């Protein structure tokens, strides 16, 4: 978990109704919310403050309140000149990513109606090839008439973000680098055809996300199974199911870092 992502999503439905929400993340793990009623940061865990003082965090909180209102208003002002374009939605992903012995990554990326619009490279706002003249002319504005904004973004993603991320990772090591063991079980039901029998090996409640669940005849893997998606539980753990179709004659393995080199073997009948 080496990257802090602060996301915004801005929805412009009418020239009278637009809306801004945002959150902070270690990958899939949410560390921060935003109460738009009060314009405040929600610290979801008691380590969500990292090594930063209340004063540094209050200062950032107000910057975000002003930005959220300001970006929303600046867009609403340019868009209300053509009610035809509504509704539309703008997304922002900003943050950083650490790599031992390297300069940290810093990024600020923007989407418009679900597609890349533009991003921040070095000190320049570069348009997406795919967003054509819209992207091009928005980048001209930011590069020529929002240098104050550019300097703020640079500093946030290249100076503040790495510092914050290190403090956040340090404060929450135990939870982020925790091991939680999967419960595993087998179940049966008829198929809608073919062999007419579905064997389902399940694993749920494991953390972290790397996991290996493969059906196996003797010590030999059994190919041709349907691998599920690794899906989230509300506790941050994950779920996975793997399906072997059979014509019903006569084992599913479960591997995870939390099992300390002792896999879970279920046999079935």
């Amino acid at each position, epitope marked *: 978990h080496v990257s802090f992502h602060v996301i915004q999503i801005f929805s412009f439905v009418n020239q009278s109704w637009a809306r801004g929400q945002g959150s902070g993340w270690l990958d899939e793990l949410q560390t921060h919310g935003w109460d738009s009623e009060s314009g405040t940061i929600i610290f979801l865990h008691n380590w969500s403050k990292g090594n930063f003082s209340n004063e540094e965090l209050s*200062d950032l909180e107000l910057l975000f309140r002003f930005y959220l209102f300001g970006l929303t*208003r600046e867009i609403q002002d340019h868009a209300s000149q053509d009610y035809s374009k509504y509704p539309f939605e703008v997304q922002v992903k900003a943050g950083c990513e650490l790599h031992s012995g390297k300069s940290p990554e810093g990024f600020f990326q923007v989407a418009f109606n679900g597609l890349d619009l533009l991003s921040f490279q070095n000190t320049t706002w570069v348009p997406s090839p795919g967003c054509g003249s819209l992207a091009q002319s928005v980048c001209h504005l930011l590069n020529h008439q929002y240098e104050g904004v550019t*300097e703020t973004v640079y500093n946030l993603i290249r100076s503040t973000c790495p510092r914050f991320l290190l403090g956040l990772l340090d404060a929450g090591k135990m939870y982020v680098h925790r091991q939680v063991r999967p419960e595993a079980w087998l179940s049966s039901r008829p198929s809608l055809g073919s062999g007419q029998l579905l064997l389902v090996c399940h694993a749920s409640g494991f953390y972290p996300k790397p996991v290996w669940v493969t059906w196996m005849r003797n010590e030999q893997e059994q190919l041709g199974t349907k691998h599920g998606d690794i899906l989230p539980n509300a506790d941050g753990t994950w779920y996975l199911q793997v399906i072997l179709e059979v014509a019903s004659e006569e084992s599913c393995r479960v591997r995870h870092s939390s099992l300390g080199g002792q896999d879970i073997i279920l046999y079935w009948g």
Partner: T-cell receptor
Amino acid sequence: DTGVSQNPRHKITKRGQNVTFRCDPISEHSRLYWYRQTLGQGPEFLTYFQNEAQLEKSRLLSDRFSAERPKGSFSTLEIQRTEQGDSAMYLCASSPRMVRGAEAFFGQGTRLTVVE
Amino acid sequence: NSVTQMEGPVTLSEEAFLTINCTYTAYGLYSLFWYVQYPGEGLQLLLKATKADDKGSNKGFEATYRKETTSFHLEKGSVQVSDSAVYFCALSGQYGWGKLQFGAGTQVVVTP
């Protein structure tokens, strides 16, 4: 050079009375601040308007104090039930939209004297 | 308050070197400023520095944004009687987007 305009320039009020101060920022300044200043001290922040939206008030702001900027332009500041300690210079400042490190343009203030 | 400036008054004669000390506690990419209030007048900006190591200059007054010493000292080589005023150090937080936060002010009295 038409700068920030504040009215009235001075105001005496009897303790217990309400007063309303007015500020007209520099044309189109999106950012508007109200501060309070007592002789011998620097301006103390009261509240900040971005356009019409009041995005920050001082934590120590009294419930007696309320400000408004209904059209993102002129602002009003009302103090209810004045007290001697409310006596001070009430400063309005405006700053341009989208300029970092911006200068704050101060008015000449409403000088408030609360008398018994 | 995160802006602390020299207690005044500072009294010196015309042609003397003036120094008003100002220290601050701030975060990220803040901006520093010096405001001046001449007798019977409103506040107005004297000089400003938006980025680290930027020197703000105006009418012989100068102040350098010095991160590593947390300083925005106001200097003027050779003061004139008309420089008699109150000087306020100030800090815009929210990475230079926020309200000015002022020090208490330092009165300068320049004697003939």
